[PDB]
A = this chain, B = another copy of it.
């Protein structure tokens, strides 16, 4: 019965052995392979990497933040997760050109894209209800009425809204799949920081799958992860070499205590990870 984390650790083995140098927007060089796909099981397990601590409080905290549609990093920075705030700051904010944007305004990110697609973006405080298109719900719905639908997709990438967001989504699209009352998900990430980012995503979208299988009375299945430019920065090569050695521990279990009906009602206090024992630190 092979372990899930070997899938992730394995992809790293590959990137290191065959990855070619490639710089980014900041020109920083990285080793990189293009086009990958891992399949983590969600069956009474939770793919929260064990060869290194994963920011669970962030994973959760941010996920709900999206569900809320909130597109103001200042509405998450106060939730105890400062992994966006630097995108709303006057400096970088105005730096992008939107010098006329309010401090904390990230723009049309996932949140607004998951509930108000195509919706003319006004502001991070502007009312958008009935405004646009909400796929997060439409996804939920379809699952319920016709789970055979092989077009239960939820795109967050918007060519129109692209040159207006704090930064393009690394999450192109995710299409849900249902068979034998099990809820499978496939996420398509365009870019992927196998070092300090990818693991945080495996969680984030394993979580959502768990939340929806909940609401829909479905049962968690397989979470397929597909990447375009899979890379790792050079700083990380050394650390990852060691972590590459650590043996993967048993994936924890995710349990929701309060039975919820409206996905929009879910609350941070509604989940509790039990059994998360990652390895100390590496650096």
Contact = CB atoms under 8 A, between A and B. Distances in A.
A222 B35 CA distance: 9
A89 interface: no
A220 to B, nearest CB: 13
Copies of the chain in the assembly: 2
Interface in A211-246: 222, 224, 226, 228-229
The contact size tier of chain A is 35 or more
Interface string A162-181: 00000010001101010110
Given A177-B34, A188-B173, A226-B37, A155 B159 contact: yes
A117 B157 CA distance: 12
A196 interface: no
A79 interface: no
Contacts of A226: 35, 37, 188, 226
Contact of A191 (B32, B36, B151): B151
A168 B150 CA distance: 10
Contacts of A228: 150, 175, 177, 186
Those 7 A-B pairs whose CB atoms lie nearest each other, nearest first: A35-B224, A133-B159, A34-B177, A37-B37, A118-B160, A150-B229, A175-B228
Nearest to A117: B159
B150 A24 contact: yes
Contacts of A122: none
B148 A23 contact: yes
Contact of A20 (B34, B157, B179, B229): B179
5 contacts: A22-B148, A34-B177, A37-B226, A172-B173, A173-B173
Nearest to A168: B151
Interface in A111-137: 117-118, 133, 135
Given A35-B37, A35-B39, A228-B177, A190 B159 contact: no
Interface in A177-214: 177, 179-180, 184, 186, 188, 190-191
